[PDB]
Amino acid sequence: LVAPQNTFLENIVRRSNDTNFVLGNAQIVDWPIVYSNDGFCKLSGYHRAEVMQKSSACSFMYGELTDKDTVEKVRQTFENYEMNSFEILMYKKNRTPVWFFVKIAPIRNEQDKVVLFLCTFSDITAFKQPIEDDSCKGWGKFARLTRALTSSRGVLQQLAPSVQKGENVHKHSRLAEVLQLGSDILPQYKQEAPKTPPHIILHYCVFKTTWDWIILILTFYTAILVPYNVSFKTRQNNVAWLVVDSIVDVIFLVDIVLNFHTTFVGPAGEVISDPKLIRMNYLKTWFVIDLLSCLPYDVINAFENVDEGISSLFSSLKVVRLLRLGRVARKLDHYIEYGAAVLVLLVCVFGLAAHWMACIWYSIGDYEIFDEDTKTIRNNSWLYQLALDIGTPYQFNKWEGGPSKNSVYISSLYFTMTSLTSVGFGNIAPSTDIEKIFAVAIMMIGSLLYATIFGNVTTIFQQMYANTNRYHEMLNSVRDFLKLYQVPKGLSERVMDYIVSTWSMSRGIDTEKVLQICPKDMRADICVHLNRKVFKEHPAFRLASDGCLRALAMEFQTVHCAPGDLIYHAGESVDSLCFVVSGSLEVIQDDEVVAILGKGDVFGDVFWKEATLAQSCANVRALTYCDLHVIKRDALQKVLEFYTAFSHSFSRNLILTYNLRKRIVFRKISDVKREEEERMKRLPPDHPVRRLFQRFRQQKE
Amino acid sequence: LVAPQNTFLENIVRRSNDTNFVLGNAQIVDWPIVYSNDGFCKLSGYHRAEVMQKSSACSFMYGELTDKDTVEKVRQTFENYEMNSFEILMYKKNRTPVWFFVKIAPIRNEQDKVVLFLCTFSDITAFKQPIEDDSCKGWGKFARLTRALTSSRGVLQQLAPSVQKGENVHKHSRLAEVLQLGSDILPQYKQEAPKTPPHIILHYCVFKTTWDWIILILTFYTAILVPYNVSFKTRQNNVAWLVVDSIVDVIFLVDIVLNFHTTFVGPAGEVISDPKLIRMNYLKTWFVIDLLSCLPYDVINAFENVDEGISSLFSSLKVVRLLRLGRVARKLDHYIEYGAAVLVLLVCVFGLAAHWMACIWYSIGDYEIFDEDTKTIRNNSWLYQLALDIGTPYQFNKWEGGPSKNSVYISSLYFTMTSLTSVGFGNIAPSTDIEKIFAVAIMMIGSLLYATIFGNVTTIFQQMYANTNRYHEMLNSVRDFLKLYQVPKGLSERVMDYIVSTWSMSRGIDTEKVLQICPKDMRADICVHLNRKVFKEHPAFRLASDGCLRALAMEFQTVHCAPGDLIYHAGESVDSLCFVVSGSLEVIQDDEVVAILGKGDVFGDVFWKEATLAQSCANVRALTYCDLHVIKRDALQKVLEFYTAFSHSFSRNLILTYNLRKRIVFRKISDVKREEEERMKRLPPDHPVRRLFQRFRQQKE
Numbered sequence A, B: 001l002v003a004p005q006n007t008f009l010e011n012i013v014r015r016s017n018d019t020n021f022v023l024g025n026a027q028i029v030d031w032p033i034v035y036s037n038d039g040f041c042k043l044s045g046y047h048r049a050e051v052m053q054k055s056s057a058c059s060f061m062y063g064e065l066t067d068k069d070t071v072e073k074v075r076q077t078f079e080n081y082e083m084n085s086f087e088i089l090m091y092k093k094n095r096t097p098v099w100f101f102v103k104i105a106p107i108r109n110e111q112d113k114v115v116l117f118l119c120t121f122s123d124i125t126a127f128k129q130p131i132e133d134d135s136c137k138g139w140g141k142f143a144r145l146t147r148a149l150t151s152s153r154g155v156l157q158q159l160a161p162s163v164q165k166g167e168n169v170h171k172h173s174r175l176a177e178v179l180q181l182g183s184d185i186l187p188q189y190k191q192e193a194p195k196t197p198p199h200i201i202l203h204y205c206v207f208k209t210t211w212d213w214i215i216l217i218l219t220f221y222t223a224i225l226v227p228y229n230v231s232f233k234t235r236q237n238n239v240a241w242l243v244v245d246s247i248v249d250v251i252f253l254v255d256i257v258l259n260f261h262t263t264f265v266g267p268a269g270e271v272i273s274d275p276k277l278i279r280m281n282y283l284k285t286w287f288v289i290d291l292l293s294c295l296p297y298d299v300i301n302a303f304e305n306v307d308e309g310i311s312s313l314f315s316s317l318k319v320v321r322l323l324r325l326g327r328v329a330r331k332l333d334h335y336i337e338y339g340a341a342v343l344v345l346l347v348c349v350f351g352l353a354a355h356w357m358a359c360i361w362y363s364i365g366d367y368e369i370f371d372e373d374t375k376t377i378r379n380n381s382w383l384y385q386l387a388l389d390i391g392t393p394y395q396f397n398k399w400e401g402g403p404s405k406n407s408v409y410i411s412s413l414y415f416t417m418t419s420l421t422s423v424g425f426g427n428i429a430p431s432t433d434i435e436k437i438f439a440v441a442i443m444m445i446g447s448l449l450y451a452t453i454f455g456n457v458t459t460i461f462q463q464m465y466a467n468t469n470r471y472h473e474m475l476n477s478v479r480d481f482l483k484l485y486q487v488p489k490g491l492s493e494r495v496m497d498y499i500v501s502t503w504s505m506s507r508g509i510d511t512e513k514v515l516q517i518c519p520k521d522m523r524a525d526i527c528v529h530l531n532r533k534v535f536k537e538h539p540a541f542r543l544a545s546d547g548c549l550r551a552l553a554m555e556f557q558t559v560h561c562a563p564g565d566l567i568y569h570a571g572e573s574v575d576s577l578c579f580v581v582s583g584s585l586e587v588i589q590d591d592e593v594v595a596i597l598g599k600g601d602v603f604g605d606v607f608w609k610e611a612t613l614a615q616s617c618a619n620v621r622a623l624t625y626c627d628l629h630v631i632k633r634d635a636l637q638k639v640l641e642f643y644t645a646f647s648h649s650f651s652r653n654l655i656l657t658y659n660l661r662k663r664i665v666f667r668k669i670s671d672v673k674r675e676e677e678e679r680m681k682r683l684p685p686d687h688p689v690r691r692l693f694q695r696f697r698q699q700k701e
C-alpha cells in the first residue's frame, strides 16, 4: 500500500518536540486560521471551533499592554512573506497577560508559490519580566507564571535551572527547536511520495524487482548444478566453472547486504523506513540461514594450500548450497495469487525434482557396482545393465570404464522421468535391494506430484470456463422455460436473440454490481462519465451544478433497445422521461406514424408541472439499435426539490420532443375519401340520443 | 450482432452532403410533419417541438408575397404522389422573405404503398432576385442574403464564384444532389437487412461457414501428411499425390482472396462494410503469414527443369506448410464457448501430436543407424531392435533394408501413444543418447497434455452435474431439518413429495429469475402469454385494454396445488382472488361441502367494493392437481385505480363463484333428527339470561 500523499501535519508533529502552533491561509484576506493543535488550545484556553476563522496575527488575543509597533511589524512580515521571531505580550480567555515567542514561517507550494502560514508559540513569562493587573501577591503571580511555562523550562531546558544566565543559552536553545522547524516546515503541503532515507532501496522498485529475478535465476542454476557436481564428479577440471561459482557466491553476498538495507512490509505497518529496525527484523527472520548458504568454499580452499583431509571434507560441505532456494518464498507469496504462473512453477519443480532424483539414482548406481572390496561387478544394478545394452561393457588389465559421463546422466534423467510421469518404459529399471526401495519412494513421491499438477490444471480450466459456463446454463434454463410454457415460435426466438445480444455487448458484466463495488464519489464520477452524452449535448444540463449533475447521474439508467422493440405501449404508465443519445425511434398512434425521434431528442411527460401519472397516448417503437438514457420521475422530482434554483432553469430549458400525455387530432385520407363518396348517395329516433347529446354538452363545461 | 432494421434517417444523412429536410405522414389529413433535422431548424428558425404537427406544405411559413398558384401546385403534387421541384418565397420566424428550392419526394413502403413524404430545401436568395420589406440599405440586404445562403454557395458551388452564369450549371448542380437524394430517398422505411456491397461475402453466412469448415479439414489433412512426407519419404512416386497437393495449394490461394473480400467484426464496430478498409485490416493482421504458407512449391519445381541443388533445397521449404493451421484460430474463438466440443478438439490435438512425435521418432531412428561413415549398424537404436523383433534384420552384398515402410510408421505411432498416454509397454523403448532425451521431452509434454485432457473432462462432468447436485443437496438439507425438528411422519412426507413434484414439473427453473433476466416489454408479453387461460376464458377481461392486461399480467402469480392440499383455511386473511384455469376444488364450512369449483371458476372476495380485509369463512381444499391463477388485492386495486373506465366494467362482469367472506346458514340432518326425537320427551332462572337476551336484541339494531 503506497501512494502520493501530503503528510503535512505528521511531519510537523514529529519535529515539534512537544510544542504548539496554528495554520492560516496566506492568499485569503485577514489571514484566516484554519487549524490549531491541542497544545495551542491548552495554552490559549479556547476550543478549536472558536479559534478558526480568526486572524493568524491574533486580534482577539491583543489588549491594552500589547505593543502596537510589534503588531505593525508582524503585519508587515505577513504582507512580505518572511521568516521572523518576535516576543509579544497577549491575553488569554481568562485575561492573564503572557509573553509569547512567536516564530512565524511562510509555507511554499509544489507550484513554488506561497499558500499557507505557520506560527509556533512559546511562553516567556518567567523568563522575560513580571507584570500583573490583579494578583493575591508577587509570589502567587510567579507561581502562576511557572505553571504556565512548563513546556520550555520542564523538558528542553532541564539542565538550565542549575546554571545561571538562561537568556544567553537556554531560551535561545529553545528557539533553536523552532529554527529546526523552519526547515521541517518546508514540506510545502504538496501531494508527495513517501520519504525514505538514503542508502536504502524500496520494496516495490523496478531495480529491486530485477535484482530479485536475477537472484531467482541464480538459485535455479545452483539447484540444477550443485547436485550434478556432487554426483557425476567433474572434479574441477576447468577453472572457469570455479570462477563462475565464486561469482555466484559474491552475488549472493551482495544480495544479503542489500536485504539488510532494503524496506519491508508488515501486517499492520505497510511501509518500514527505520534502517536499524529493518536490520534487526532481518536478523530475527532469515539472516543466519542465508549467510550459511552463501560462503565461498572453493575460494577458501584455493589459497591456504593446506591438509588434504581438511580440503576434501570441506568440499563435501557444498551440499548446503541446495538450501539457497529459500529466496524463492518471496515470489511464491508474490505470484501465488495468479493461476497460470502456478502451473509453470509446478512444471519447473517437476523438472528440478527429476534432475535431483536422477542424480541420486546415479549416486546409488556408483555405490552399488563397487560395493565389495573383492571387486565384484555383480551381474546386476541398473548401471551395469545400461552398459551391457548401449555397448562398451567393463573389463580389466585396473578397471576400464564402460559408458560415457554425459550419456549416463541423460539415461538417469530419463529413468527418473519415467518413474515420475507414470510412463514406466523399463529399459532402465530397478533390480537390487536399495535400488528397488529408492524406486518405490520415487513412485510414491512422483504420483503425488503428478496428481498435484493435474489438480492445478483442472483448477485453471475451471477458473476460465466459469464465466461462460454459467451463461450457457442460464441460456439452457431459459430455453427449457420457453419449451415448458409453450411460448410462440417468434416471441421466444426474439427473447433468445435479446439474451444473446446482451451477452455479446456486455461480455458478461453486471454494471450495477460493478458500481456497487466502487465507493460513493468514484461511483458518482463513473455515472457522470456514462451519461456524458446526455449532459454535454442537451441545453437543460449546461446550467446545472456539479452536485446536481452527480445526483442526476446516480438515478440515470440506460437502455439498449433492439430494432422493432417498443419502449412505451399505448395505455402504459409514463413514469420516466427518456433522452435519445443515439439511434432512431418512431411514435405510432392509431397505427400511424406521428413523430420520428433521432439523436439528441427527448420524450416522456412533464412531471414537475402537471404532477400526476398519465396514460401513454401512443406506442413508441425503435427503428435501429437505439441507446436510451431514462430517469424515473420520482427520483428526478426529488432531485429538483433538492436543487430549487435549478428546477426553474430546467423547466425553462427542457422542451420535450414529444409528450406521450397529449392526444393528436387527425383523420386518415382513405376515410375522408369514403366520406366524400358517401356524400353523393343520400328525427323520430332523435329523443333517446338527444338526452345523450345534452349530457355530453353538460359534461363539456 | 445483426438484425433486420429500418435505417431510414441514417441513409438520408449519408446522402445529404450537408443539407436539410423534413418528414410528414402521407395517409394522415393535412400532411402532418413528424420530423425535422437540425439544419432545417437552423434555417427556418424554429425548435423541433413547434415545427411538428404542422402541414408539410408549410402554411405557417407563407405570407403576402408568397404566390398562391405555386402553393396550389404543391398541394396538387401532394395529392397525386409525385416527385417535383419548386422555387417558392416564404417567411421565417423573424419575418425575412426567402426563396426555397423545395425538392418534394413521396416514399413507398415494403408493402409497395406510399406512406411518408420527404421535402429537401435550399436557399435561392442571392441566386434568384432581391426583394425586401424593410432594410438599412441594399448592400445590407445583400449581405444578409449571403449569410443565409452559405450551404449551397460555400461548399458545393465553391468553383462557381469565379466563373459566370451560375444559374446555367451551379444551381442546377446543387439541385443534382437533391436528384441523387430521390434515389437515396427510396429506402421505403422498411425493416430491411444490412446493406452490403456486391463482390463481398458475409461473416456469418451458410456458404462462408461451409468454406471455413472445408479449410479446417484441409488444414488438418496438411498437418497429418506433410510431416509424413518429410520423414518417411514417399519421394513423389505417384503424381496423384502431387496433383492433390497442388489442388490444396490452389484452394488455399482462393481462400486468401476470399478473406481479402469478406466482412469483419471489431469490438466497437459489429459489422464492417468498407472493402478497402477490410483489405487493409487483413494486411495488418494475418496476410503475410498466410501467403507464406500457401505457395505451390511442387508446381514451381515441376516446370523449369533446372538445378538439382536448387530443387532439393527448395523441396525442404515444404516444412512451412505446418504453419497452415493458423486458420484454426477462427473456430477456436467460435467454439471455445461450448464445453463438449473442446474435448473433441483436445482429442484431435492429441492424435495430431502423436503423429508428429512418431514422425520425429522415425527421423531420429533414420539419423542414428547410419550416423558414421564407416557404416556401423551399432547393435542399438529402437529401429534396429524393432527389425530384430518382427523378423527381417539388416544385411549386405550395398545395404538391404529390414522392416517395411508401412509397419515402421505404425510402430512409431504406437510408441508415441505409449509415451503420451502413460501406458509405457516398452517393446519399443529409448536406448541411445539423443533418443533418450527425446523420450524424456515427449514424456514431459505428454503428461501435461494428458493432465489438460483430464481437467477438461472433469470440468465437463461438473458443468452437467451442477444443476442436479445442488437440488440433491437441497433435498438432503430439507430431510435433515425434518429429522432435527422431529416433524411428524405424514407432514414431512407430504413436504418431501411436494418438493420432488415441483422439481419434476419445473425441471429446475426459477420462473421469477427468468422473468427478471428478460427486459420490461418482453417480460410483460411473457406474463400475458402465461395467463392466456385467464384472460381469454373469463368475461371480465375481454373488454380490458392491452395496457391494462399487461399491468395485470405482471402482478398475476400462478400456483400448482396438490390433491388434498388446502389453499385458504377458515380464519386466514382473504387477500387475493384466485381464478381456476384447471382442476377441481371443494369448499368446506363446518366440515361440510358447500361448493365445488371447477374449470373457469373464481373465488376470493370483492375488495374494490367492500374495501376491508375479511376473515376466510371456510376451508378450501383441492381435489386434483389444480392450477390456480391468483392476484394480490393491493396490486389489483392499484391497477383498477389506474384504469378508471375499466374498473366499472370489471365490477359489472366479475361474479365470484363463491365469496369466502359470507357465512352460509344451514343445519345438518342428523341434528334435526335428534331434535325431532327430543321433541316427544318433555322461568325462575330466566332473569340472569333475560338481561343477556335484551343486550343481544339491543346489539341487533
Ligand SMILES: *[C@@H]1O[C@H](CO)[C@@H](O)[C@H](O)[C@H]1NC(C)=O
Pocket (backbone or CB within 6 Å): A376, A378, A379
Ligand atoms: C556373472 O555372469 C556371467 C555370465 O554372464 C558369469 O560367467 C559369471 O561367473 C557371473 N559372475 C559371478 C560372480 O558369478
Ligand SMILES: *[C@@H]1O[C@H](CO)[C@@H](O)[C@H](O)[C@H]1NC(C)=O
Pocket (backbone or CB within 6 Å): B376, B378, B379
Ligand atoms: C554387435 O553384436 C554382435 C552379436 O550380436 C557381434 O557379433 C558384433 O561384433 C557387434 N558389433 C560390433 C560393431 O561390435
